[PDB]
Amino acid sequence: FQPTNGVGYQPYRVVVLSFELLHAPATVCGPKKSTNLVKNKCVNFNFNG
Amino acid sequence: DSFVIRGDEVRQIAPGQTGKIADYNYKLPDDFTGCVIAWNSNNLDSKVG
Amino acid sequence: SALGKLQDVVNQNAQALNTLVKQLSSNFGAISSVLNDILSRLDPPEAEV
Amino acid sequence: QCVNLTTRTQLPPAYTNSFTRGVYYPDKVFRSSVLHS
């Protein structure tokens, strides 16, 4: 790699993230604020994604 | 609707994709019917210094 | 064995209901079999499809 | 370090019948009371 190279010859850093969703215990989750759990009634719920 | 952005944010204009521009600056709906036209402007919109 | 003919009807009715519940399980050629899962993973614009 | 244990010759392979042993869980999904293929 050289600084005078073209755009197609410039070095690009590639990071690929591979995921598996909703088939195992999740060590990592999105920053959604936890709310109180309400049971025995109709509610819109998001549990572990 | 007209604006000026940088190149790496141009893909953020397309509907369904997120970013700084898509989340905090300008958002298109998922059912958007229209066109996106982007062209280079480094000759006139770039100032020395 | 005399009442076997009547039982046939019970077997067939139950078998058919069972076959339908089994089909409800198939992914039908998608990324996921669970409807809540595909609503979770994707934004609308291809989730409708 | 190495020790050259030497088998003068390999004994002919012995074949035994596996008795329907060895089926693993496919994925970590809780399944109960079902015949899942």
CA angle in degrees (0–180, nearest 5) for A14-A24-A40: 125
Residues near B26 by Cβ (< 8 Å), separated by ≥ 6? B1, B3, B13
**Contact list, C41 vs chain B (CB under 8 Å):** none
| A21 inside 8 A of chain C by CB | yes
Nearest residue of chain C to residue B17 (CA atoms): C43
Calpha distance B17→B28 (Å, rounded): 9
Helices and strands in chain B: count of H runs, count of E runs: 1, 0
Calpha distance B25→B15 (Å, rounded): 13
Pick from B30, B36, B34, B31: which is nearest to B9 by CA? B36
Residues near A12 by Cβ (< 8 Å), separated by ≥ 6? none
Calpha distance A18→D2 (Å, rounded): 41
Give the resolution to one decimal, in Å.
3.9
Residues near B1 by Cβ (< 8 Å), separated by ≥ 6? B26
